Amino acid sequence: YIGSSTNLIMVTTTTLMLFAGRFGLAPSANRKATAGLKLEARESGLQTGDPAGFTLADTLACGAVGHIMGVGIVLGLKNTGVLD
Amino acid sequence: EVKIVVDRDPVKTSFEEWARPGHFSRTLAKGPDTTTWIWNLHADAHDFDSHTGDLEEISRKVFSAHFGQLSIIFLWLSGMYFHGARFSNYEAWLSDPTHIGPSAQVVWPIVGQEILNGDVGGGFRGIQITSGFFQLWRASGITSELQLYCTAIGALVFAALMLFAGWFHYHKAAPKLAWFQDVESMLNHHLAGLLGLGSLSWAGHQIHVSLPINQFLDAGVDPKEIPLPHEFILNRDLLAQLYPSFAEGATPFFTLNWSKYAEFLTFRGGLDPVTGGLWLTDIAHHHLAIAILFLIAGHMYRTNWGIGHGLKDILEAHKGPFTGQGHKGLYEILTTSWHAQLSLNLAMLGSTTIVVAHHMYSMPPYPYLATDYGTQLSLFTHHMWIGGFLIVGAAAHAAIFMVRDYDPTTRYNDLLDRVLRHRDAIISHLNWVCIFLGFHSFGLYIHNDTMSALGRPQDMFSDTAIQLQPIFAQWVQNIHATAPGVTAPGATTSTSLTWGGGELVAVGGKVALLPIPLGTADFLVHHIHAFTIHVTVLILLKGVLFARSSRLIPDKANLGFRFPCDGPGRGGTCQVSAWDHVFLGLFWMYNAISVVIFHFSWKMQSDVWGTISDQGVVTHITGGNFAQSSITINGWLRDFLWAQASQVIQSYGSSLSAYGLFFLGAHFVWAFSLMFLFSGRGYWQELIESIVWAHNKLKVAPATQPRALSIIQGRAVGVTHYLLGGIATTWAFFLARIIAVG
Amino acid sequence: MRDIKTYLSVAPVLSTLWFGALAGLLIEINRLFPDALSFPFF
Amino acid sequence: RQLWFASKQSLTYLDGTLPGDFGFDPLGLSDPEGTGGFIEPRWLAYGEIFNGRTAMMGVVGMIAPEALGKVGLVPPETAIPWFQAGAIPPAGTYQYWADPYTLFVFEMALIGFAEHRRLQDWYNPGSMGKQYFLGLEKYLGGSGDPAYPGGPIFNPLGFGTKSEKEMKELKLKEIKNGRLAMLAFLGMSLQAIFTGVGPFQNLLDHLSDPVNNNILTSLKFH
Ligand code: CLA
Ligand SMILES: CC1=C[C@H](O)CC(C)(C)[C@H]1/C=C/C(C)=C/C=C/C(C)=C/C=C/C=C(C)/C=C/C=C(C)/C=C/C1=C(C)C[C@H](O)CC1(C)C
Ligand SMILES: CC1=C(/C=C/C(C)=C/C=C/C(C)=C/C=C/C=C(C)/C=C/C=C(C)/C=C/C2=C(C)CCCC2(C)C)C(C)(C)CCC1
Ligand SMILES: CC1=C(C/C=C(\C)CCC[C@H](C)CCC[C@H](C)CCCC(C)C)C(=O)c2ccccc2C1=O
Ligand code: SF4
């Protein structure tokens, strides 16, 4: 049952934020969004592999909110059935 | 960053100071000058602020002190579970909960006091309790004396754990300051760990234990044959025989087919007709919904990694034109002062306790709590008093902060500054309202009473005369009655049964709830509460603002937090210390609350509670007289004090005798307090002298010279007794009355 | 050891110990000679 | 020096001199600034090696008896999955020479002598070879390192005979094995909750049918 509706919605949501958290469309651990814009990047010291500063704590946040926006859309199931 | 640096062995565990009373304070340690010494020993025992001058030690003492407070509660819990196991008819109560009183105290028969062992039925005897543990132990599916015993041991163990923990963290390894001040992680754990995981774990126990078991008892089975709660958690097929959604296991939870658990996770609303309580499916769902919300909220404030907010920066963006610098600087003054936090926490925890008491009588959460008139009245009354006091405490410690910790050269705040600068406006405007409400709330009662006395019952304010209908409450009642239709399509019924529509819920010939009407007689009393609340706010608020200076005394701050007076000059300056403002507030807190718990008691007996006919007609306890007799002050004397004190007064010779004595005994203490409030010290000091002389004659003059109580102690003892006499009198008035009539 | 005894000798601790003993004694006597409205020995 | 998921905090104190180091520590624990009790980097290292050793004999006993029951000369009566050996009565039991709770107290006493003495040498080096203990005092002094006491009773033949690098190489092997066993035992448990057919069986279930993949199934049965 991999590839049903509830799956494609999940994989897009999670990857979109991980893209967003690493490429520049979200505040990661190394970018803080102020009262206005997002580009207020700083250092935090989480020595890792990803050259973009994407750490072990940012592969979890964007993964976490990857599912929070993944459940609200899927459980908007007034037009995709009630039981899968 | 955020780490755990503590110390090793700050203060050495030893018994020396246990034999040097008053070691903590430099003044008290020199010895007992006079009997004034043995009063100042307790008055400054816990004032850790006055002992030392740095925040680190004050912190470690309050941190360890809480462990003691935490430990006692566990010991208190342990007794309650133990007592319910060894000295109760609980297991009998589980058979016919409708008509067997909960009893969990049994007295030794020494001096005839075995008459107190009442015939609570169920083949047992003893003091009929009213704290309502039994509905709590049934809602958790206990159904055994053995299980009440083991938790009692488990509760007792934690008490030793906490008490040990307190010792360890003050004498062996005490935390440092930097540990304490890291308040981002503080909030972060409490939201996710304590509040969050607390519900989710509990939502666990309801799903696997309380729900399927109570579904047997409600279905109707003897308690002895209900398979033990670890049978469901092992034999998964048993849960199938009630709840088929438990066949698939936890995989729907992982495939977002959440509508499969609809058997035991619902959104019903209303109350359960069988047991008169909420539907345990909703309660099961409720803690689960709460769990997620708290847990996510836990992940907000930045602790050690990149993500998260800064509590300092949140307070430093909201600054407005009218307000100026806004909430800048509040981070400090809420971090380097315990009296700020204690004042702020007290108000919220004080307020929440009240909202608890408004909900637990309208959405009865435990089974067979609705038809327990002894419990409903007590639980509602209890948390009102607890809620009332804690709010008053928030005024005292806010006042203490203004005197001791506030300082406009370093911990400067702008909002707290602007609030000080126009304090004359704040009190005067609050003064006018308290007068406006005073005339238009009490006066309407007085005018009603005068017109009724003169034979003009067509000029009174009532439903049958000049009318005052609360429409705004009647409108909002209407909205919640039709909410299940449109504005909340999921809900089967309204969130309660007191909304202005629906139908009653009858349990064993006793009304659970029914729609509560709101006519004119309710309109007046709601504007009484708005009056006493405002006046109580006025006294406490004046104390907080004027705790440092006023147009009378320009240097009141220099005189401390609780000083008696500044002498009889300038016309007389008795009672200008902030401590004497809270001293005055206590009476009004005692005044506001008392009318609330009077309003609740009469309204429910007259309009809600009462038996129910088999035919279907309902007869309330007092015959529905609240709507006509509560509008005249004499009405509150005839039909409430005089007519509902019958049960307490003639309670001699039966198990309700102990209330008959306390009723009197609480009058004596109340009238006793007046000797301290009315009189003054200088008279009692002199009479003491003459008494002291006679002892010189017989050589029995003590060496701790007798003294009269200090000025602010004469008041402190005066208010304390007055409150104790007033509250206890109502206590004996309520329990004995309601226990006899239902 | 000395400090423990001294603490046990401070006034409040003696009071509960003294009065507690007194309460026990009176309760026992009332358990053995109850109702006791007169002193009918001599 | 290979580093795995390092952190700025980690490399301030994880100098690599401690064996088994890979600079992996994102929770502030081994930080030497904060030292009350049980947060000493030595004690944590002490608890690290011991837990591994207990795992290194705990794991093998957690798969030996049933797998030896697969071909070995063990009479099948005492060939059982580990959780039904008697540790967890609701999983099952077996009647040994004792009846349980006498085995426990016996075990707790025998352990008590070794454990407490094993503790004192951490508090007071060389102490456990001073008071009389029926001889044997010549050995129970230890070499000064609590985790590596040495002595002919503990290091009988003597490896790490003379090479620190080898010892550092050896101790590196001792921890990575230790980490491997701790995770492995955590594997034998969580498998049991979900699978419930015993550890070594659950490898066959993935042997004869790799398409089993009980992950996607997630059925729970005792
Ligand atoms: C029964 C006793 C009693 C009464 C009537 C009052 C009355 C009052 N107190 Mg009060 N007080 C009392 C006991 C009482 N107190 C006690 C025991 C304490 C100690 C704890 C206090 C402590 C206290 C404090 C600390 C404060 C008050 C305040 C007030 C006033 C606010 C209410 C208001 O404006 O209503 C208006 C007046 C009434 C409702 C009285 C009845 C008037 C009726 C409606 C009509 C009167 C007749 C009419 C004028 C016709 C005149 C006839 C003509 C021949 C003259 C009010 C004057 C507060 C205040 O003054 O600030 C606002 C305040 O801050 N009192
Ligand atoms: C480092 C760090 C850092 C950062 O900062 C944070 C974090 C990441 C969180 C952290 C992490 C941590 C971790 C992961 C840990 C782990 C551990 C373990 C697992 C252990 C085990 C451990 C384990 C162990 C010892 C085990 C052992 C076992 C045994 C003996 C067994 C026994 C047995 C047998 C045979 C059989 C029988 O019939 C039964 C029994 C009796 C049962
Ligand atoms: C290829 C490659 C790569 C990549 C990789 C990857 C792909 C990763 C991923 C990762 C991931 C993939 C992650 C994830 C994460 C996730 C998470 C962490 C989650 C969380 C969750 C949550 C938070 C949830 C919650 C909830 C619940 C539990 C219930 C209720 C509802 C909700 C949903 C809310 C690397 C880098 C190596 C390099 C280059 C190459
Ligand atoms: C009555 C009264 C007194 C007199 C009360 C006093 C002096 C204290 C009451 C006596 C207490 C009970 C001391 C007795 C306890 C001693 C420790 C002796 C104990 C011995 C017993 C075991 C018998 C004041 O001092 C006073 C001060 C200010 C305003 C009003 C008043 C006031 O109204
Ligand atoms: S009467 Fe008492 S309180 Fe008033 S001024 Fe005199 S001393 Fe002060």
From Swiss-Prot, chain A:
Chain ranges passing through the membrane: 6-26, 52-77
Chief place of localization: plastid
Alphabetically ordered keywords of this record: Chloroplast, Membrane, Photosynthesis, Photosystem I, Plastid, Thylakoid, Transit peptide, Transmembrane, Transmembrane helix
Designated gene of the protein: PSAK
Topology in the lipid bilayer: Multi-pass membrane protein
Protein name as annotated: Photosystem I reaction center subunit psaK, chloroplastic
GO cellular component, as recorded: chloroplast thylakoid membrane; photosystem I
GO biological process, one term: photosynthesis
Family to which the UniProt record says this protein belongs: Belongs to the PsaG/PsaK family.
Domain of life: Eukaryota
Compartments in which it is found: Plastid, Chloroplast thylakoid membrane
Record's keyword annotation contains Nucleus: no
Species the sequence originates in: Hordeum vulgare (Barley)
